[PDB]
Design a protein around this nucleic acid. Structure first.
Length: 383
RNA sequence: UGUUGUAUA
């Protein structure tokens, strides 16, 4: 199916091939893996005369290039390094097809490039086509990237229109694999008023017997939205969001997705929020350290809480008993809590580390017999 | 020895 020229260029002939030599073959080269990189490289150091010759061979069938696995890079080159007249002619071929391209695996790259480098009257013409289909775009595996592009670099008036389509479905779209990222970009990149309205929407609604925010923090996708809502909420709303988190801390530290929201607060939140999380953990360090999910939260607590809060959690482990065992001994033998013991050794202050080593000392000579306890021994060979 | 989400050769 390939021309002789393309086949030979692929098979190492013409090591000095120039743009002018492949006249009449631009469309075929563009739809070829190596023909496309050739045109892209050659365009970079090509004269305006050459670039225009290339452009005339792709303009008619430009759409076909936009939806091609290899040709879409060529279209993108002209949207970024072509003449004003070339950018505008390509925008004309796009007119009436923006939606199809934004829904397309390669077309959506071309749309984002066009939105970034064509003039304003053409950006607004292109965005006008999209505003009629925001609902579909927000949930599409490719269109969601085009919506996020507008939110990150578009003009405020256009961001506001995207917020209006999301205004009302924050809870549902936050649980959507593709749309949850758009909710994030709205929360981070829209106006102050629009961010507060979106955050307030889930603050004021209930999901049956659950608070909407609690549901979101348990969701595989919406937990990322809440983390962003925590990062950008103004102080008054932030306290409202955090109140839902604190009320459900015990549930969330044991949840497969909620435990990351708790850790996010421990690593990047305010210290008094960490102090309240620690106060819920206190008295349950033994049990939570043995939990697949909560054990990670216990680790973040001793790492990021205050000096005395960490000391309290470590001292609890040192002083509490598990039936006839010391809690430390039970923790060392557990598949998860052994990691907590190791982290506690690492972060303890020398005086407290000595107390930890004292409770560990009777067991050193027999840790090798334990599936997980032996990793305490392995670690201790650095102390 | 232990847990989270979409981008092109």
């Amino acid at each position: 199916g390939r021309s002789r020229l393309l086949e030979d260029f692929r098979n190492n002939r013409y090591p000095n091939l120039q743009l002018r030599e492949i006249a009449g073959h631009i469309m075929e080269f563009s739809q070829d893996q190596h023909g496309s990189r050739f045109i892209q490289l050659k365009l970079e150091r090509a004269t305006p005369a050459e670039r225009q010759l290339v452009f005339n061979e792709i303009l008619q069938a430009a759409y076909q290039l936009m939806v091609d696995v290899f040709g879409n890079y060529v279209i993108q080159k002209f949207f970024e390094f072509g003449s004003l007249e070339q950018k505008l002619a390509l925008a004309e071929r796009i007119r009436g097809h923006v939606l199809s391209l934004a829904l397309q695996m390669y077309g959506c790259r071309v749309i984002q490039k066009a939105l970034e480098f064509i003039p304003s009257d053409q950006q607004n013409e292109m965005v006008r086509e999209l505003h009629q289909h925001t609902e579909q775009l927000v949930q599409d595996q490719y269109g969601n990237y085009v919506i996020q592009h507008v939110l990150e670099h578009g003009r405020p008036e256009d961001k506001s229109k995207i917020v209006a389509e999301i205004r009302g479905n924050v809870l549902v779209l936050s649980q959507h694999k593709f749309a949850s990222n758009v909710v994030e970009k709205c929360v981070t990149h829209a106006s102050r008023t629009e961010r507060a309205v979106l955050i307030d929407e889930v603050c004021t609604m209930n999901d049956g017997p659950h608070s909407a925010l609690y549901t979101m923090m348990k969701d595989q996708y919406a937990n990322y939205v809440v983390q962003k809502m925590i990062d950008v909420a103004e102080p008054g709303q932030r306290k409202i969001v955090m109140h839902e988190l604190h009320q459900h801390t015990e549930q969330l530290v044991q949840d497969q997705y909620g435990n990351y929201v708790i850790q996010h607060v421990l690593e990047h939140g305010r210290p008094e929020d960490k102090s309240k999380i620690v106060a819920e953990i206190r008295g349950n360090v033994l049990v939570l350290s043995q939990h697949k999910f909560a054990s990670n939260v216990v680790e973040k607590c001793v790492t990021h809480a205050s000096r005395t809060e960490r000391a309290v959690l470590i001292d609890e482990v040192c002083t509490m008993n598990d039936g006839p065992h010391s809690a430390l001994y039970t923790m060392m033998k557990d598949q998860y809590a052994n990691y907590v013991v190791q982290k506690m050794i690492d972060v303890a202050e020398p005086g407290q580390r000595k107390i930890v080593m004292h409770k560990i000392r009777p067991h050193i000579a027999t840790l090798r017999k334990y599936t997980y306890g032996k990793h305490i021994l392995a670690k201790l060979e650095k102390y």
